[PDB]
């Protein structure tokens, strides 16, 4: 009675599988559409893409429709602000067409593929419109979410049309001027049917976050889940300031010239060489503020301490753990767990070591951090090999299978700095010799 | 260079510091003051006190500041609603020492005593009572956030007074029909002058949380900070629906006969006894629904498998982690790390196992758990004793030094059922022997 057996790779406890002659599959809680509103440049494309690269990043599969780009793939070329015009009877119906047609791929995704957030990124300025979304998600099952971003601030407006209106495939055979002029023209297209969401009556009973003046102020009305409620937490976090993200791995350690894992070994004669090293480049950035990040780890807080500066230790950032392979060298992994080594190498982000963690296992550890990285502005992150692939996946927005091989080589500072699409990242090698600790699939 | 030492206790590596000859000190971010706001039987109290228990749970020390309770010192009996009335003078008088002595007080606990938060628990309903407030705050370099409860339906209002106004200390000489009537009159003295927080002009740049409609709605404004964002998430996953709590631990293992702590033993033939008497018992409480869960420790799962009910298995639950001392017995504990075992008597919540963990660290894990547990309804939680103390000293506010010593014996469900005040804890042992792993200080 109770028999259960661990298994191999996540090593979790399931109960005896002892299928009958005939076995049988059952295949495969609800979905949810996460609605847009809002007039053009107003920050909608940045939300949705920021807050799936999150979902995403802690396991929640998560995908975009953009209604725009249906609208670039079923018309070829762009010509102007003409194509928006209410009274444009012709493209007002390709306009529905595509957004039905999204629609269409959003149903796909979240009852055919597995998805479980599907972000619904266009204006759905009009209430018609955000009827017949509902009506398609209670027809479905699917939850409905709304975010709406409001404002009425021309300098934010024209700073958006500058910063990544301009350069969209819409507008690549226009200069900035042309395309500045037919972008304001777009935006008062969508004006006179733009019916905000209106919590106090009319959208009473929707579940909807108003984010208002850049998240100056929100409005939130009937947070449904655990989802929307982090989604909310999420959005209050996050800013808009410029600032930059170093990551880095603490300077060479003991282990590393050993070819040993884990552990807490301290700085080894060129980890200690790196720490100055890092301390001239952090000194030569000059940022009028910086944090500094370390795990509790011995070598990372030996690198902290070369700068001279005031530095916090999160047990968060200690290096993934590799319960029994603790302080053995892959090669004494290899010869006396076979099993073990060829199973990791096979599944290397859901692969557990036994009594220790996955890289899956890391991301619920590292959500902390993120949450508090957004909530920041300059912050130097001293931690170690894993640690640094997990949350440069999220920063980079790369998936769970890519994460546990992207490169972060010891003596390198990985520099990030926020632009509206994402992270432009920069590589700065400091110039100071270590041993190699990347190993490829 | 760069020579760290690791702390006895909660293995700190820290810069080993070689004082000189006269050692200094440098004794001792900024303090909040949360100030409630809103008309009398509006929950604010309720508010009060269940954050508190959250923020010093998480390790933020927080206290609570009642007017009324300063009211009641230096008014010795309470005669009627005529105290409240705004023409009485004398008592308008009172009523403001009685909050500035609380102000003094609020100041006392954040700038000398080590206080991070103080919760202003007052109406709070005037401009000029939050203009004082402000002042307050800004002279003494004291972060200001306001939380205003505001709702207008007189079943909510009723339910309020009938479920824990009557029973005030206020009402001890009353029958339940003269203190409903007295306390309908008391919130009338209010209503005149009271003015809600308006983020639209008036209290534009003010830090705020509106709880509209029992937390049907939330107007959120300028939220400066990290714990302003926590509280603003907490809100939104605490309800107050009508539900239970059922914590207990896995039925007896292996490991627990043999007096070994950690590892990932089996239940023992009294711990399957357990877990059919555990599904006995949850059958008879005949709850719609129930959600259940585990840790990813064999004993939890099997102890869950009896139940024949669905369940999550999540890694925060896991046991806490002894480190180099995982599968030992305490004797062996005792005479292969006599020191590490006086440091942990000593110091049990802070002690950190060597490669392991502590209470603190616990709580830090636990805290995703907490957050889950409050949006939830009914839930059965199967775990492992720190972890059992942990939850239950959110659950019933015990401090961090009596939290390793909470008595939570094996084969003994723990029923919480949340009353107006906090939790009324039942105990239901469940008739199945075991050995008992409870050490006292
Ligand atoms: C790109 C880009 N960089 O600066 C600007 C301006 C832009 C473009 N943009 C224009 C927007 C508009 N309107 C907008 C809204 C956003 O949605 C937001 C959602 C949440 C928050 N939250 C916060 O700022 C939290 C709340 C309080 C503390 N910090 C801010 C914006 C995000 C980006 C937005
Ligand atoms: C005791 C007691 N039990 O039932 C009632 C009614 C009471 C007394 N009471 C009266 C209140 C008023 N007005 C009130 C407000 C509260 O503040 C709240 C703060 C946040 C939330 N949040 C939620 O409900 C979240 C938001 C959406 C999902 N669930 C609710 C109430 C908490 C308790 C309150
Ligand atoms: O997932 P991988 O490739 O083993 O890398 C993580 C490893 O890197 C190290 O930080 C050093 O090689 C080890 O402590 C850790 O086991
Ligand atoms: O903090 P204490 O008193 O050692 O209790 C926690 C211990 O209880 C056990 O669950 C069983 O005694 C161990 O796994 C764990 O070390």
């Given at each position: 009675p109770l028999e259960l057996t661990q298994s191999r790779v996540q090593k979790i406890w399931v109960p005896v599988d002892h299928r009958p002659s005939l076995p049988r599959s059952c295949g495969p809680n609800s979905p949810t559409v996460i609605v847009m509103v809002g007039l053009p440049a107003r920050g909608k494309t940045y939300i949705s893409k920021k807050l799936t690269r999150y979902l995403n990043w802690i396991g929640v599969p998560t995908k975009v429709f953009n209604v725009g780009e249906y609208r670039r793939e079923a018309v070829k070329q762009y010509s102007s602000y003409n194509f928006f015009r209410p009274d444009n009877e012709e493209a007002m119906k390709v306009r529905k067409q595509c957004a039905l047609a999204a629609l269409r791929d959003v149903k796909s995704y979240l009852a055919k593929e597995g998805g479980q957030i599907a972000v619904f990124d266009?204006?759905?300025?009009?209430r018609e419109r955000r009827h017949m979304i509902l009506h398609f998600a209670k027809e479905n099952d699917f939850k409905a979410f709304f975010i709406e971003s409001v404002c009425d601030d021309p300098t934010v407006v024209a700073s958006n049309i500058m910063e990544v209106k301009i350069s969209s495939p819409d507008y690549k055979d226009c200069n900035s001027a042309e395309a500045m002029d037919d972008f304001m023209k777009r935006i008062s297209c969508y004006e006179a049917s733009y019916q905000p969401l209106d919590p106090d009556k009319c959208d009473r009973d929707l579940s909807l976050i108003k984010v208002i003046d850049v998240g100056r102020r929100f409005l939130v009305n009937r947070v449904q889940d655990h989802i929307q409620s982090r989604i909310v937490y999420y959005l209050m976090n996050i800013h808009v300031q410029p600032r930059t993200i170093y990551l880095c791995r603490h300077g060479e350690n003991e282990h590393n010239l050993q070819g040993?894992?884990?552990?807490?070994s301290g700085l080894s004669s060129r980890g200690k060489k790196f720490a100055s090293a890092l301390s001239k480049f952090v000194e030569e950035q000059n940022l009028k503020d910086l944090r500094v990040w370390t795990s509790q780890l011995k070598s990372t807080i030996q690198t902290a301490e070369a700068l001279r500066l005031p530095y916090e230790q999160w047990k968060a950032l200690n290096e993934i753990d590799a319960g029994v392979c603790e302080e053995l060298t892959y090669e004494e992994i290899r010869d006396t767990y076979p099993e073990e080594y060829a199973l990791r190498e096979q599944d290397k982000y859901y692969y557990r070591y036994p009594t220790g963690e996955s890289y899956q296992d890391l991301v619920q550890r590292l959500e902390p951090v993120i949450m508090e990285l957004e909530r920041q502005e300059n912050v130097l992150v001293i931690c170690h090999q894993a640690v640094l692939r997990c949350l440069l996946a999220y920063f980079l927005d790369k998936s769970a299978e890519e994460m546990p091989y992207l490169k972060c080589p010891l003596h390198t500072v990985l520099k990030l700095t926020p632009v509206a699409y994402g992270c432009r990242v920069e590589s700065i090698y400091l110039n100071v010799e270590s041993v190699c600790t990347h190993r490829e699939r």
């Amino acid at each position: 009675p109770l028999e259960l057996t661990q298994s191999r790779v996540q090593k979790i406890w399931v109960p005896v599988d002892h299928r009958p002659s005939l076995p049988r599959s059952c295949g495969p809680n609800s979905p949810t559409v996460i609605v847009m509103v809002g007039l053009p440049a107003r920050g909608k494309t940045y939300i949705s893409k920021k807050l799936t690269r999150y979902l995403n990043w802690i396991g929640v599969p998560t995908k975009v429709f953009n209604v725009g780009e249906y609208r670039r793939e079923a018309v070829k070329q762009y010509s102007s602000y003409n194509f928006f015009r209410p009274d444009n009877e012709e493209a007002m119906k390709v306009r529905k067409q595509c957004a039905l047609a999204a629609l269409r791929d959003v149903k796909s995704y979240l009852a055919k593929e597995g998805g479980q957030i599907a972000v619904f990124d266009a204006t759905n300025t009009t209430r018609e419109r955000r009827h017949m979304i509902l009506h398609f998600a209670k027809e479905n099952d699917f939850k409905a979410f709304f975010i709406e971003s409001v404002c009425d601030d021309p300098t934010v407006v024209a700073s958006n049309i500058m910063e990544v209106k301009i350069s969209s495939p819409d507008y690549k055979d226009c200069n900035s001027a042309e395309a500045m002029d037919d972008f304001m023209k777009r935006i008062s297209c969508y004006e006179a049917s733009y019916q905000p969401l209106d919590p106090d009556k009319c959208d009473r009973d929707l579940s909807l976050i108003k984010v208002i003046d850049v998240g100056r102020r929100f409005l939130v009305n009937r947070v449904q889940d655990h989802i929307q409620s982090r989604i909310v937490y999420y959005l209050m976090n996050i800013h808009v300031q410029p600032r930059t993200i170093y990551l880095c791995r603490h300077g060479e350690n003991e282990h590393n010239l050993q070819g040993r894992i884990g552990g807490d070994s301290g700085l080894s004669s060129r980890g200690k060489k790196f720490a100055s090293a890092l301390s001239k480049f952090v000194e030569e950035q000059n940022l009028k503020d910086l944090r500094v990040w370390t795990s509790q780890l011995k070598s990372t807080i030996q690198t902290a301490e070369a700068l001279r500066l005031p530095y916090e230790q999160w047990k968060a950032l200690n290096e993934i753990d590799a319960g029994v392979c603790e302080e053995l060298t892959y090669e004494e992994i290899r010869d006396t767990y076979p099993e073990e080594y060829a199973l990791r190498e096979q599944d290397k982000y859901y692969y557990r070591y036994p009594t220790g963690e996955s890289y899956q296992d890391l991301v619920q550890r590292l959500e902390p951090v993120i949450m508090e990285l957004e909530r920041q502005e300059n912050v130097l992150v001293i931690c170690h090999q894993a640690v640094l692939r997990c949350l440069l996946a999220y920063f980079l927005d790369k998936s769970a299978e890519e994460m546990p091989y992207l490169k972060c080589p010891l003596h390198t500072v990985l520099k990030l700095t926020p632009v509206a699409y994402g992270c432009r990242v920069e590589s700065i090698y400091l110039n100071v010799e270590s041993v190699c600790t990347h190993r490829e699939r």
